[PDB]
């Protein structure tokens, strides 16, 4: 009675992986390589479509990670190679205009540097932070001398994140989850289709996520497996917490040639008092923020469980401190004042000051062999940013006791991406299909 009928243009799809390209809208995200965005993007709501999403198996995150690494390397590749700099340094402490915190923190080094002419040498003196310099035996070397070569970042290229929109190729589409309070691993009752993602700023940080999206309704706790003590917890905040970071010291930047066409930048001197870099977090706002986080953690851990916050257990600064790029400088802030409380049964203009260290020799993305020198920046630096989420680890104490402990985590950049790319998945469009009908083909 019934016959096979072939249809083309059928609105169906399959989970799929493909390569996405950037659309943008003097940086390290090749925004000049990217195409421009669509001024009028078309978001189509799909009525009566329930789609299952899994943010932990989302390969968009893996593709973003790789793209960021490659873009980074390409922007650095053509810049000055500071191999003439791995020399014996003669260093003493800065004692003039020093406060108590900056005691032995900053060092005054001198060395024999090359010049344009192969035949000549110059004696250069620069200030360095103690984190960049390691003692040889007053004889010091830079920390990278026994593991890597240094490339000076180009002074003309910024490190300020520029939103990146990822776009699917024709034949593919990106499904977006609009379900508020979506925990990122589950069926999503309300979805829409987009061709490009919203603009995601590739902000790099460790313990606290900065300048991301806010939760629509309430703090959202997400993890790959909540009962697994080995997993990280991503917390998306409902309201931002404003954090004010600064390096008060007025740096005078000097530049010399170290070979034909090769300019090296260094801190020459500091004008006035030498003080420690720091970040200020409103005390009241931070206290409200944690109370909200605790109420939500209890949905998984119970009322009878005490929720305790504690500082990181230890390791390299890159995993024990809050790292970020502020004004182009690299800060390592100790967030102990933010995670030092016990909440039992959920129990002005004050502020929390976090001391920060400054480091010029940078080893990003947890790689070995590619090290960067961050030129110093002339003048005084201040930046203001939003804390939009936290990364926490868990010591599973409640198994044996009444108290559970959470500590700042992070350090794996993929988890910072997952923060924004949890609403999206890539699907392939499959326009062909068949179904029985009453229709037959005349011969």
């Amino acid at each position: 009675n019934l016959w096979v009928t072939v249809y083309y243009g059928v609105p169906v799809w399959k989970d799929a992986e493909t390569t996405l390209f950037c659309a943008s809208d003097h940086n390290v995200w090749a925004t000049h390589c990217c195409v421009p965005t669509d001024p009028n993007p078309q978001e189509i709501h799909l009525e009566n479509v329930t789609e299952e999403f899994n943010m932990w198996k989302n390969n968009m995150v893996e593709q973003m990670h790789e793209d960021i690494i490659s873009l980074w390397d390409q922007s650095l590749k053509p810049c000055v190679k500071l191999t003439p700099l791995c020399v014996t340094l003669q260093c003493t402490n800065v004692t003039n205009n020093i406060t108590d915190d900056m005691r032995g923190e900053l060092k005054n080094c001198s060395f024999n540097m090359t010049t344009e002419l192969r035949d000549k040498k110059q004696k250069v003196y620069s200030l360095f932070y103690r984190l960049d310099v390691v003692q040889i035996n007053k004889e010091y070397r830079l920390i990278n001398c026994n593991t890597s070569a240094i490339t000076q970042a180009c002074p003309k290229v910024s490190f300020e994140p520029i939103p990146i929109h990822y776009c699917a190729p024709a034949g593919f589409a990106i499904l977006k989850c609009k379900d508020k309070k979506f925990n990122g691993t589950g069926p999503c009752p309300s979805v829409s289709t987009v061709q490009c993602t919203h603009g995601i700023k590739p902000v790099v940080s460790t313990q606290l996520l900065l300048n991301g999206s806010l939760a629509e309704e309430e703090v959202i706790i997400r993890s790959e497996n909540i009962t697994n003590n080995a997993k990280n917890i991503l917390v998306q905040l409902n309201t931002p917490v404003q954090i004010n970071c600064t390096r008060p010291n007025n740096n005078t930047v000097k530049s010399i040639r170290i070979g034909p066409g090769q300019w090296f930048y260094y801190t020459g001197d500091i004008i006035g008092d030498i003080r420690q870099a720091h970040c200020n977090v409103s005390k009241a706002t931070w206290n409200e923020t944690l109370g909200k986080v605790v109420k939500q953690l209890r949905k998984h851990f119970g009322n009878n469980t005490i929720i305790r916050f504690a500082q990181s257990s230890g390791g390299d600064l890159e995993v024990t401190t809050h790292s970020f790029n502020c004004g182009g400088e690299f800060f390592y802030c100790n967030t102990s004042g933010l995670f030092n409380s016990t909440w039992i049964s959920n129990t002005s203009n004050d502020s929390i000051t976090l001391p920060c260290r400054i480091k010029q020799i940078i080893n990003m993305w947890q790689r070995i062999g590619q090290a960067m020198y961050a030129p110093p920046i002339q003048g005084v630096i201040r930046c203001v940013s939003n804390i939009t989420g936290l990364i926490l680890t868990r010591d599973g104490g409640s198994t044996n006791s009444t108290t559970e402990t959470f500590r700042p985590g992070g350090g794996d950049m993929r988890d910072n991406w997952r923060s924004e790319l949890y609403k999206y998945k890539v699907v392939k469009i499959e326009p062909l299909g068949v179904a029985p009908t009453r229709c037959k083909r005349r011969v």
């Binding site: 249809y7 243009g9 059928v10 090749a30 009566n48 499959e430 037959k440 011969v443």
Partner: protein, 123 residues
């Protein structure tokens, strides 16, 4: 004016009226990633077009053929398939039998290419 895939989730008999909307959007180191993507869009498009070609459905969004429907693949009623069901669901229900049906569609068209040639020869 539902937009691309705006009919998804809609009754199969209703969604079938917007086929043009999806069909017209199938062709819609950093430059290599773009170049590769452009090539894939073309390759996928052409593979589907080739199937329509060998099945004798070239140039049509809706094509009727002479392969009978087998109750083995599905014994559902038309009022249960074209109504009270969407295309995503249908695709899952008969996913197994897709390869079988495609093989039959090809066999049928090849037989009808021969039959047509013989009739013309007789004219």
């Amino acid at each position: 004016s539902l937009g691309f895939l705006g009919a998804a989730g809609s009754t199969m008999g209703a969604a079938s009226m917007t086929l043009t909307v999806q069909a017209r959007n199938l062709l819609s180191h950093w430059g290599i990633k773009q170049l590769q993507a452009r090539v894939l869009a073309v390759e996928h498009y052409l593979r589907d077009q080739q199937l329509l070609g060998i099945w004798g459905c070239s140039g049509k969004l809706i094509c009727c053929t002479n392969v009978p429907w087998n109750s083995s693949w599905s014994n559902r009623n038309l009022s249960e398939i074209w109504d009270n069901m969407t295309w995503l669901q249908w695709d899952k229900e008969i996913s197994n039998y897709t390869q079988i049906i495609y093989g039959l569609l090809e066999e049928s068209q090849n037989q009808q290419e021969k039959n047509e040639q013989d009739l013309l020869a007789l004219d």
